[PDB]
Design a protein around this ligand. Structure first.
Ligand SMILES: Nc1ncnc2c1ncn2[C@@H]1O[C@H](COP(=O)(O)OP(=O)(O)O)[C@@H](O)[C@H]1O
Ligand SMILES: Nc1ncnc2c1ncn2[C@@H]1O[C@H](COP(=O)(O)OP(=O)(O)O)[C@@H](O)[C@H]1O
Ligand SMILES: Nc1ncnc2c1ncn2[C@@H]1O[C@H](COP(=O)(O)OP(=O)(O)O)[C@@H](O)[C@H]1O
Ligand code: BEF
Ligand code: BEF
Ligand code: BEF
Ligand SMILES: [Mg+2]
Ligand SMILES: [Mg+2]
Ligand SMILES: [Mg+2]
Lengths: 100, 50, 417, 164, 417, 210
RNA sequence: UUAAACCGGCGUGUGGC
């Protein structure tokens, strides 16, 4: 499977998801102090060889798997700041999100 | 105003308090009892600060 | 106070009463919406409202108190009934309940009934300890319900003819088989008026399904008793709703040992609605009717019965023929064998401006000896013997002429001498 | 939204092991476990999604008991005056309405509960395949022995136990 | 100024008026687009425009003032109505509103109505304090609406025959059951002309649904009154839009105690559109019609009624038969039982070039005694008695010959002597 | 005990018997539901109930003991019959079976028949070793079943006429061709009464459909 | 067998002392 930036982060508080937008990238002008999610890069990890029921189930429930992987960038511990510019670049063929 | 008197006020005076219904009572139960406190506790030393 | 107490009167008194209550412009919203706002304000005055209505049970377990004047339909004044009452008393569908109600707090829906004070015009103790309706012992019509008025009107004959064609009694199951443009409307009108005037002891419950709203207004304010109807303004869903609701009200009232007359017109449109609201079984019958489309209509039709213990349920449902297609006729067929009382009306004679054109030949009653005394039965047998060998037009003109030449039915017997 | 859930319940292969009723009660349990994650308040939430008619509508269970911890699910033995509850046990409320709708972790919970429910249905199936001989001599090989019970196999994944 | 004041006249006067206003080439854009640009310039001159239109309410709460000449459809001159007016007066659908309007600033959509000056040709105070339509008391046709012209034209018979077959009055519900190629067009044409000439007091509202544009142009500029139509150029969405909009306008006009005649042709295409725009219930009926596909058509049909307080709504909707399939006939069936006024036309006689071919046998009116005087009713009864025993061709040729041999209807009575 | 033993009597005796059993308000539920609750309590007293009914076989292989007074229909007192009995004796549809039954544990459905004690008013040994019905040799009516009552009633003629029109006997196949409103009801009534009074040896089974 | 709790390797370049 590929890598996604869906803002549906599992096992995280709502206070950490408050800064995020609908896409998964924080708006231009929201300051951050501690380690706070600003890219919603959660992706599957679950291996193949799943029974047909598992595959049909994860297909009928959208595109969801062992997505619990955090795999998200936060600010380094110790540095504050205020985001003022976001830069995103997609590979030819990959669908462009609304923020791009 | 102060819960120093509401600590001596159990849950039997919640829905008898005027206009405590579904969502206001929900907030009262949530933001009070989740912070380690219990709604209604017997004590005898709140006046003398003891 | 009571909703019907505000409902018997037009929207004008409701408007001035709301102006007394000091609210927003009432005439803008609907008059039943006016009643909702008015009861909300009355509850705001710090008093417990007293409401009443018949119970409708959904899948969730709670209930709705549908009002009589709202045609037993969904309304903003339908009192919510918490499941706890169904746990304590287990009030079934059709139970007329009156009790204390409170206003709906915000985010709620309607008024909630706190405590029941009256169960079917009786103490609540009889509600729990009572014998059920489908648990009764059905019987035949023992007591005779006379139909003639007694002062000799022109449509009074329309009642006398029944007493001369086939008697009608408590607990009977009557069918009225007639084509369109035959004279069913005025017939059931004077039938209800005669039942009310001559027999005010029984509970007159006239029913109307899918007719003109002008007909509903003419029926409601002409006859004695409650008039619930559902015209074409409501789909098959509300049709079956009002039908099952009035039938369950009748079931409960018979359980309370009371007599209920249910004059329904027509049964064919009810059957069409039923066939519309049944799941498809992958097959169709002759005429275009589903297989299981007749089960619930047959239940609703056979709900009528005469009871050993107390009360009676007598339904007179009009059957419609000459519709061009088969399915309606099919209904009629499936309904001749279940009802024990047939009454057939003539349109071929009605087009001749010959009223009332009742089919004296194919009319009849099963176990009709329990519906009339001995010598009157002998005389009716001889009278039908006289009526038989003459033609249809002959019998009908003889009927109309010699009965308009009479005033009452026993006077008719004493004149035939 | 609800049409998607209807499509899922139409597309379930084991409609016979899990008909519509068991499917929407499983979704009741799934939304309950999801609300366990939506709010830090651990509250049991029946939602009666009303599969055939419509969609979910969130409730709140009172869990009648004299305690007060997690007061979203605490009611004494007789606190049934307001809302005309008038019930000691089983009286449950509908305070929070239309909570967080389906999201990805809700679908995760639904997926895991429905697969373990298919497993429970297969357990009912092996129950039926081992039954019809209740009170008869049967052969069986054992798998594990413990101080309190032992496990037994007959074939065709037929699992049973013999207590101490 | 008023949009209709610029709409009664063709595109040529609009072009020269825009040239007077000094704008871009007007003939290039559409004539209603011309009117939009012209009103924009007129507002640029520093004056408040005076607009009018009937209200259409969307889900958002605001309203649109659809104009009469635009067939009650979406247009660039549809005045926006802020929700504040619906909060103050609560103007419902169909309320003819006239008042001050402002130009749309950029990024806006259309003109906005500032303050209402006329509500349904009455003061705005009557708009808030008023009794509603579905809140009225429906009744039968009390006042008779004569149809004969009085100077003896050839198609004047087409009105007389109605007065001789079955009378028509205020608040009635009329059906015209006829196959294609029978003579419905000219019939409703002379019916509207006779109603307008002989009874100019009532509001003539002719309606046309899914016909030829040439037919729409022939209808608009031939009869007295407003002519709103929606041909096949518009899908079922705009069909149901214009239908509900004219029916709500009629409801409001009856609420204001005025009589509204709604001549609609045809009701079957309206039912087809309705069946097209209903959600699927996972089942189909006989002929290919959804279950709930009839609820809204039945509402639209039963909107007609006679009122105790004031005003009347009389609809004459033409039913179409001989279409080969079942569903249309199904509609017809579902519509014979709801309307209290039937009128049947003959195509088997129309192919013989025998006009007008009205079915004198199956025509009739319920409660027709309130539609005509006493002795005229006796004479009509005797005349139908004479017409009955002869054949169809016999009755029809007798009708056409002996009525063309007469000039008026009472003259016809005095000649039959 | 036996369900029919509680069924011959109206709902009133069932209500007072349930009050003797100390349960919830019985009159509220149905009288056959009353019987279900009453048998549940009777089984709670620590005794094996004795039930009876005719067997109905579904596709799964188990059976239901439908009772006589319930019109041979589905009811809460339909005794479940485990397939093991169909493996041992192979009781077919219509076999009147009487035996010991147990209460339904929770999550179960109805009472379960443990051991059969009576098979068609005979020993269970005759149930397995027996010649079947469609396996018989059909014949004509040899023995005559007289119909006249013998004391001369007015509807007694309605039996005599049959004996005068066409006799009726055992094993016959009779049709009654009649239009509606002809007199079939009272006819079959006095026919059954005459068969019962004059010939009480045969098993009278009157049937009514719709 | 079951329950509870917890879970910079290398090179390069630059600059500074
Ligand atoms: N008893 C009666 N006396 C006089 N006229 C009658 C009588 N019954 C029916 N009619 C006539 O029948 C017409 C209405 O018939 P209706 O009740 O609509 O028949 P249906 O119910 O079969 O359509 C009226 O115009 C009326 O003149
Ligand atoms: N009163 C009449 N006099 C003469 N011709 C008529 C009359 N009514 C109808 N027609 C004939 O009917 C034709 C139009 O029929 P039309 O109204 O379009 O059929 P439909 O009834 O299907 O709408 C014309 O060609 C005309 O000759
Ligand atoms: N022997 C008889 N003596 C007196 N009345 C009879 C006799 N036979 C029939 N009847 C009358 O005929 C009717 C027959 O009804 P029913 O038995 O229901 O006929 P069917 O069976 O054809 O429906 C009864 O109402 C009864 O009054
Ligand atoms: F025209 Be009738 F009322 F069927
Ligand atoms: F073709 Be017609 F107008 F029915
Ligand atoms: F012939 Be009847 F319907 F019994
Ligand atoms: Mg009628
Ligand atoms: Mg035409
Ligand atoms: Mg019979």
């Amino acid at each position: 499977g590929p890598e996604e930036i869906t803002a549906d982060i599992p096992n995280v508080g709502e206070a950490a998801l408050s800064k995020l937008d609908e896409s998964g990238i924080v708006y231009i002008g929201a300051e951050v102090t501690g380690g706070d999610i600003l890219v919603g890069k959660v992706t599957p990890k679950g291996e193949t060889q799943l029974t047909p029921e598992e595959k049909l189930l994860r297909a009928i429930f959208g595109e969801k798997a062992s997505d619990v992987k955090d795999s998200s960038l936060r600010v380094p511990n110790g540095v504050s700041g205020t985001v003022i510019d976001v830069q995103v670049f997609t590979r030819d063929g990959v669908e462009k999100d609304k923020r791009a | 105003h102060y819960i120093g008197d509401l600590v001596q006020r159990t849950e039997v005076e919640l829905l008898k308090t005027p206009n405590l219904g579904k969502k206001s009572l929900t907030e009262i139960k949530d933001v009070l009892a989740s912070r380690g406190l219990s709604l209604g506790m017997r004590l005898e030393n709140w006046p003398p600060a003891s | 106070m009571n909703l019907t107490e505000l409902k018997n009167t037009p929207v004008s008194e409701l408007i001035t009463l709301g102006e007394n209550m000091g609210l927003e412009n009432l005439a803008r919203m609907r008059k039943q919406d006016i009643i909702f706002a008015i009861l909300k304000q009355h509850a705001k005055s710090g008093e417990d409202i007293f409401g009443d209505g018949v119970l409708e049970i959904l899948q969730d377990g709670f209930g709705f108190l549908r009002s009589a004047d709202s045609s037993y339909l969904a309304g903003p004044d339908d009192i919510y009934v918490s499941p706890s009452q169904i746990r304590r008393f287990n009030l079934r569908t059709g139970d007329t309940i009156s009790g204390k109600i409170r206003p709906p707090k915000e985010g709620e829906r309607y008024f909630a009934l706190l405590k029941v004070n009256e169960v079917n015009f009786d103490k609540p103790e009889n509600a729990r300890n009572k014998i059920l309706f489908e648990n009764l012992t059905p019987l035949h019509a023992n007591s005779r319900l006379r139909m003639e008025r007694g002062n000799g009107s022109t449509e009074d004959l329309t009642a006398r003819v029944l007493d001369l064609a086939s008697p009608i009694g408590r607990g009977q199951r009557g069918l009225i088989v007639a084509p369109p443009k035959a004279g069913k409307t005025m017939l059931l009108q004077n039938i209800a008026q005669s039942i009310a005037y001559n027999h005010p002891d029984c509970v007159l419950m006239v029913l109307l399904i899918d007719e003109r709203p002008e007909e509903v207004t003419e029926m409601q304010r002409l006859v004695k008793g409650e008039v619930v109807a559902s015209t074409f303004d409501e789909p098959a869903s509300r049709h079956v709703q009002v039908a099952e609701m009035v039938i369950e009200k009748a079931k409960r009232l018979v359980e309370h040992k009371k007599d209920v007359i249910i004059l329904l017109d027509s049964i064919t449109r009810l059957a069409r609605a039923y066939n519309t609201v049944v799941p498809a079984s992958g097959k169709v019958l002759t005429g275009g009717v589903d297989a299981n489309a007749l089960h619930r209509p047959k239940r609703f039709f056979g709900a009528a019965r005469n009871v050993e213990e107390g009360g009676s349920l007598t339904i007179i449902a009009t059957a419609l023929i000459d519709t061009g297609s088969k399915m309606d006729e099919v209904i009629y067929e499936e309904f001749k064998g279940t009802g024990n009382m047939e009454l057939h009306l003539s349109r071929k004679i009605a087009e001749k401006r010959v009223f009332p054109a009742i089919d004296y030949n194919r009319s009849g009653t099963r176990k009709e000896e329990l519906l009339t005394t001995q010598e009157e039965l002998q005389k009716m047998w001889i009278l039908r013997k006289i009526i038989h060998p003459m033609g249809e037009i002959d019998a009908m003109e003889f009927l109309i002429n010699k009965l308009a030449m009479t005033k009452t039915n026993d006077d008719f017997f004493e004149m035939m001498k | 939204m609800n049409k998607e859930i209807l499509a899922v319940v139409e597309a379930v292969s084991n409609e016979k092991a899990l008909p519509r009723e068991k499917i929407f009660e499983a979704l009741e349990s799934a939304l309950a476990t999801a609300t366990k994650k939506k709010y830090e308040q651990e509250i049991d939430v029946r939602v009666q999604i009303d599969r055939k008619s419509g969609d979910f509508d969130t409730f709140r269970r009172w869990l009648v008991v004299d305690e007060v911890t997690q007061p979203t699910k605490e009611i004494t033995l007789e606190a049934a005056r307001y809302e005309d509850e008038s019930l000691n046990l089983g009286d449950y409320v509908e305070d929070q309405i239309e909570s967080v709708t389906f999201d990805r972790i809700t679908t995760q919970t639904a997926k895991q509960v429905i697969v373990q429910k298919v497993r429970e249905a297969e357990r009912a199936m092996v129950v039926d395949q081992f039954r019809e001989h209740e009170g008869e001599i049967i052969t069986g090989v054992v798998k594990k022995v413990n101080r309190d019970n032992i496990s037994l196999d007959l074939g065709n994944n037929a699992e049973a136990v013999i207590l101490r």
